[PDB]
Design a protein around this ligand. Structure first.
Ligand SMILES: C=C1/C(=C\C=C2/CCC[C@]3(C)[C@@H]([C@H](C)CC(=O)O)CC[C@@H]23)C[C@@H](O)C[C@@H]1O
Lengths: 239, 10
């Protein structure tokens, strides 16, 4: 029927957080190693991924209650979900006209052939694009896109997490917010929330295929030396 | 441990 004060505040800082960690002009991309079209795009794309990981953390540090989880749970959540939040947040640069991420002119317009030259096979990129297409096609609001990312970050079923009772509770409070938001403030879409939860299941499958290609890549020194320290730490198997 | 992840988390 209505949104509560606590729930309006959960929405406000989530939207603000995303605004503090997402630049719709992509003006920092000039500071990355330049794109080159055997894996000539890996330097740039590792730098892009490493940048975004930093972004995903600053966002995560502002999700209500994340800060209060023990350090090991904050780490466990960010380690398993980071790539999924990157796929989710990447949707803002994806374009249906060109079927690509358009972060700039010809340099920063990333297509499937490009991400191939960063070491990823069709078996991951073919679902990723279809996920991007269907996610764009839901025409989410700022408030829903940002709830979706926080709901993804707070999944209790990640390897490593220890206090899955409390993480469960934080994620259900956000699912309450999203469901209330969609009903009160989203004219259409009675089935939209069920569709958004489906998108989470898709990202789990994306997460698994990525992990395999990344494990294979990270284990090859000629390629792992083109990665960044942060990428190797967040996507790597340490504890 | 995770020195870089730790540092980014204030
Ligand atoms: C990640 C982002 C952007 C693009 C994301 C892109 C376009 C390039 C290829 C990526 C990284 C995919 C690769 C295969 C995953 C990986 O490197 O292991 C995942 C999302 C894809 C640009 C802008 O939207 C900022 C956002 O923060």
């Amino acid at each position: 029927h209505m949104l509560s004060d606590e729930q309006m505040q959960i929405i406000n800082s989530l939207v603000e957080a995303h605004h503090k960690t997402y630049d719709d002009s992509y003006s920092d991309f000039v500071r990355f190693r330049p794109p080159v079209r055997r894996l000539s795009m890996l330097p740039h794309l590792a730098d892009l991924v490493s940048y975004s990981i930093q972004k995903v953390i600053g966002f995560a540090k502002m999700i209500p209650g994340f800060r209060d989880l023990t350090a090991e749970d904050q780490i466990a959540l960010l380690k398993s979900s980071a790539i999924e939040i990157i796929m989710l947040r990447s949707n803002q640069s994806f374009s249906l006209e060109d079927m690509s991420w358009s972060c700039g002119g010809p340099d920063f317009k990333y297509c499937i052939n490009d991400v191939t030259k960063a070491g990823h096979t069709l078996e991951l990129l073919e679902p990723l694009v279809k996920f991007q297409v269907g996610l764009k096609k839901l025409k989410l609001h700022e408030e829903e896109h940002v709830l979706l990312m926080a709901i993804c970050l707070l999944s209790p079923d990640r390897p490593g997490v220890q206090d899955h009772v409390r993480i469960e509770a934080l994620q259900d409070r956000l699912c309450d917010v999203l469901q209330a938001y969609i009903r009160i403030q989203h004219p259409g879409g009675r089935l939209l929330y069920a569709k958004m939860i489906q998108k989470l299941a898709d990202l789990r499958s994306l997460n698994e295929e990525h992990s395999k290609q990344y494990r294979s890549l990270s284990f090859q020194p000629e390629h792992s030396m083109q990665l960044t320290p942060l990428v190797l730490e967040v996507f790597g198997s340490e504890v | 441990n995770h020195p870089m992840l730790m540092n980014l988390l204030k």
